């Protein structure tokens with residue numbers, strides 16, 4: 677699944693992960709650590725929402 681950051685153009689795709697910051701491809705949103713933030717704008721998990 678994919679989630680948009682409300683605050684910038686970034687999209688977290690679970691099939692991509694966030695590898696530059698230590699999150700492997702295939703990591704589900706539910707499994708991102710509580711201190712994970714948007715790689716571009718620093719917004720927290722509470723500022724992400726599912727998109728298609």
Ligand SMILES: [Fe+3]
Nearest residue numbers: 681684714717
């Ligand atoms: Fe962002």
Ligand code: NA
Nearest residue numbers: 705706707708
């Ligand atoms: Na969790």
Ligand code: NA
Nearest residue numbers: 696697715716
């Ligand atoms: Na970073």
